[PDB]
C-alpha cells in the first residue's frame, strides 16, 4: 500500500521531540502503524547506541546538532530519520510480507483470522530471520534489525508477527505478553493463542501450538492465564519499553533514555499504560535516573504498577513487587523492602517452578542469597556500632518470604531450594536475636472464619505457614539457638480428603 500522506509528512525526524510527535500522531489513529514506529525506533537506536560514529562516506545520512546538557555543555548530534530511508525500509518489509502470503487463499468470515493464516505469517517471519544462536546480542529487537541485518531476538520475533499481520490488515491479531515470554492472540473474543517464537533452547518445536499447556502447568512464563492481551496502543507501549539505551555494559545513551522516558509519559497521559505494570515500572526507573519537573515520584509510579497488576491481572505478576522492593532496598528502607519481598513471595507461592522460569528464579536467588544478607549485615553494623533487626515484623516478613519460596517448590517438577539457599537462610536468621525472634508467634488455625450477631474473633506478630517445609521447622526458627544442621536438612529434600469430607457431612 505504502505510507499515507499524513504519515510521510511527519518526516524528517530531527530531534527527540520530532519522534515524540510521530508517536503522538500514530497513537491518535485507530490503527497506529507498528511497522513504521518500530523501524524508526530501531533506526534511531542504531546510531545512538549500536554505532555512534557519524559515517562521513554516507551523504543521504545527516545529523541534527542541538545543545548537549549543561553543566557539561557541548553539542549532541541526533540521527535524522529521513523519509527516503524510512520509506525504503518500510517498503522492503511490506513487500516481503505481502508477496509471501496470498490473502485470496484465506477466507476470513468476520473480522477474524484463521489459525492457518497466523501460522503462515508466523512461518514467513521465522524463515526470513536469522538467530544469534551462540551469542547474546542486544539491539536486535526492532523491525529495523529484521529488515537490515535479518537478526531478531526472542520477543522481537513475536512483535514482528503482529506487525506483519497488521501490514496485511489482520486487525484481530494481537501481541500476548508474560513477564518473560511473548506470543500471539487472535480470533473472536481474541481467545485463540499461537506460539510464534522460542524460549530457552530446544523449544522451537513449540511454535504453532496453543498456550494452554503452559497456562495449565502453572509456570511463571504464562502467568496462570493472567498475561497481557495487548491492543494496538499497548503494542506501541511494548516497543517503547523494548528500547535499549545500553551502549555497553556500563554506558547508556542519554537521548535513548530521554526518548524512552518522554514516550512513556506520552503513553501515560493518554491512559495506555493503565494495564501495563512493567511499563509503569520502567517509567519509575527512568524518573529515578532523571526526574522530570512536575511528574509523579517513582514510589508513586511503582505503586501504580502494583495497582494495575491487582486490578487487571488478578495480582498474579511478580515484577511489580520486585521493582518496589528494589527501590526501598536502594534507599535503605529495610522494613519496606522486606515487606515488598514478602508480597513477592506470596504471589509466587501458587506457581510451579519449571525449567523455563529460570529468569524469575535468578531474581529470587539473588534476593535471598545476596541482597537480603547484605542488607541485614548492613543493619547489624548500625546496631552494635550504636532498627530492623529488633522488630519482629521484619523477621516475620523474612519468614513469609521463605515460606512462599517453599510453597513455590511444592508440586514443581524440579527442586528449588538447595545447599546454596540453606547457608544464607541460616545466616539471615542468626542476624536476629532470640529475644526478637521469639516475639513472633507461629501457629496454625483452630477455627475458620469469625462469628457475628457484633463480631466474634477466635484466638507479637502472629504468623502461619503455607508450605510443608516451613512449618516442619517452625520450632527451630524460633529457638534461642539456631540448629544450623537441622534447618539446612529440612530446607532441602488418595481420595482421602474426599472420603473424609463425606464423614463430616453424613
Swiss-Prot record:
Q: Name one GO biological process term.
A: regulation of transcription by RNA polymerase II
Query: What happens when you mutate residue 12 to L?
Result: In MEN1; no effect on histone methylation; almost no effect on JUND-binding
Q: What is the effect of changing residue 421 to R?
A: In MEN1; no effect on histone methylation; almost no effect on JUND-binding; modest repression of JUND transactivation
Specify the effect of residue 309 to P: In MEN1; no effect on histone methylation; almost no effect on JUND-binding
Question: What effect is documented for mutating residue 160 to P?
Answer: In MEN1; strong decrease in JUND-binding
Describe the effect of residue 139 to D: In MEN1; almost complete loss of histone methylation; strong decrease in JUND-binding; no repression of JUND transactivation; reduced interaction with KMT2A
Q: What is the effect of changing residue 323 to A?
A: Reduced interaction with KMT2A
Instruction: Please give the annotated consequence of changing residue 274 to A.
Output: In parathyroid tumor
- Region annotated Interaction with FANCD2 sits at 214-386
Q: Effect of altering residue 253 to W? A: In parathyroid tumor
* Consequence the record notes for mutating residue 139 to Y: In MEN1; familial and sporadic cases; almost no effect on JUND-binding; no repression of JUND transactivation
**Impact of mutating residue 281 to R?**
In MEN1; loss of interaction with KMT2A and JUND
Associated disorder? Familial multiple endocrine neoplasia type I: Autosomal dominant disorder characterized by tumors of the parathyroid glands, gastro-intestinal endocrine tissue, the anterior pituitary and other tissues. Cutaneous lesions and nervous-tissue tumors can exist. Prognosis in MEN1 patients is related to hormonal hypersecretion by tumors, such as hypergastrinemia causing severe peptic ulcer disease (Zollinger-Ellison syndrome, ZES), primary hyperparathyroidism, and acute forms of hyperinsulinemia.
**The name this protein goes by in its record:** Menin
Q: Which organism is it from?
A: Homo sapiens (Human)
Amino acid at each position: 500500500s505504502g505510507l499515507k500522506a499524513a504519515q510521510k509528512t511527519l518526516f524528517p525526524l530531527r530531534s527527540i521531540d520530532d519522534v515524540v510527535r510521530l508517536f503522538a500522531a500514530e497513537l491518535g489513529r485507530e490503527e497506529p502503524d507498528l511497522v513504521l514506529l518500530s523501524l524508526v525506533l530501531g533506526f534511531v537506536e542504531h546510531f545512538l547506541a549500536v554505532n555512534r560514529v557519524i559515517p562521513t562516506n554516507v551523504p543521504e545520512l545527516t545529523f541534527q546538532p542541538s545543545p548537549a546538557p549543561d553543566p557539561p555543555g557541548g553539542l549532541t548530534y541526533f540521527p535524522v530519520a529521513d523519509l527516503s530511508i524510512i520509506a525504503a525500509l518500510y517498503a522492503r518489509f511490506t513487500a516481503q510480507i505481502r508477496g509471501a502470503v496470498d490473502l485470496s487463499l484465506y477466507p476470513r468470515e468476520g473480522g477474524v483470522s484463521s489459525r492457518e493464516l497466523v501460522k503462515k505469517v508466523s512461518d514467513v517471519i521465522w524463515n526470513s530471520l536469522s538467530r544469534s544462536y551462540f551469542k547474546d546480542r542486544a539491539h536486535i529487537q526492532s523491525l529495523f534489525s529484521f529488515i537490515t541485518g535479518t537478526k531478531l531476538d526472542s520477543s522481537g520475533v513475536a512483535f514482528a508477527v503482529v506487525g506483519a499481520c497488521q501490514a496485511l490488515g489482520l486487525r484481530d491479531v494481537h501481541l500476548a505478553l508474560s513477564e518473560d515470554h511473548a506470543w500471539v492472540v487472535f480470533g473472536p473474543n481474541g481467545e485463540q493463542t499461537a506460539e510464534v517464537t522460542w524460549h530457552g533452547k530446544g523449544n522451537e518445536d513449540r511454535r504453532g501450538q496453543t498456550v494452554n499447556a503452559g497456562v495449565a502447568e502453572r509456570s511463571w512464563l504464562y502467568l496462570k492465564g493472567s498475561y497481557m492481551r495487548c491492543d494496538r496502543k499497548m503494542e506501541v507501549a511494548f516497543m517503547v519499553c523494548a528500547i535499549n539505551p545500553s551502549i555497553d555494559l556500563h554506558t547508556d545513551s542519554l537521548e535513548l533514555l530521554q526518548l524512552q522516558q518522554k514516550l512513556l509519559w506520552l503513553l501515560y497521559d493518554l491512559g495506555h499504560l493503565e494495564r501495563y505494570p512493567m511499563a509503569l515500572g520502567n517509567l519509575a526507573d527512568l524518573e529515578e535516573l532523571e526526574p522530570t519537573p512536575g511528574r509523579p515520584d517513582p514510589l508513586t509510579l511503582y505503586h501504580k504498577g502494583i495497582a494495575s497488576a491487582k486490578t487487571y491481572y488478578r495480582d498474579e505478576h511478580i515484577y511489580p513487587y520486585m521493582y518496589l522492593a528494589g527501590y526501598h532496598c536502594r534507599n535503605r528502607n529495610v522494613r519496606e523492602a522486606l515487606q515488598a519481598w514478602a508480597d513477592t513471595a506470596t504471589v509466587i507461592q501458587d506457581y510451579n517452578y519449571c525449567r523455563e522460569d529460570e529468569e524469575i528464579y535468578k531474581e529470587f536467588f539473588e534476593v535471598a542469597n545476596d541482597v537480603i544478607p547484605n542488607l541485614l549485615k548492613e543493619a547489624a553494623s548500625l546496631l552494635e556500632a550504636g532498627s530492623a533487626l529488633q522488630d519482629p515484623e521484619c523477621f516475620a516478613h523474612l519468614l513469609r518470604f521463605y515460606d512462599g519460596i517453599c510453597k513455590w517448590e511444592e508440586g514443581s517438577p524440579t527442586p528449588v531450594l538447595h545447599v546454596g539457599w540453606a547457608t544464607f537462610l541460616v545466616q539471615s536468621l542468626g542476624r536476629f536475636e532470640g529475644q526478637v525472634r521469639q516475639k513472633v508467634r507461629i501457629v496454625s488455625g483452630t477455627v475458620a472464619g469469625t462469628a457475628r450477631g457484633t463480631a466474634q474473633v477466635p484466638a507479637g506478630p502472629v504468623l502461619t505457614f503455607q508450605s510443608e517445609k516451613m512449618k516442619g521447622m517452625k520450632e527451630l526458627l524460633v529457638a534461642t539457638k539456631i540448629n544450623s544442621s537441622a534447618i539446612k536438612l529440612q530446607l532441602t529434600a488418595s481420595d482421602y480428603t474426599l472420603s473424609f469430607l463425606k464423614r463430616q457431612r453424613k
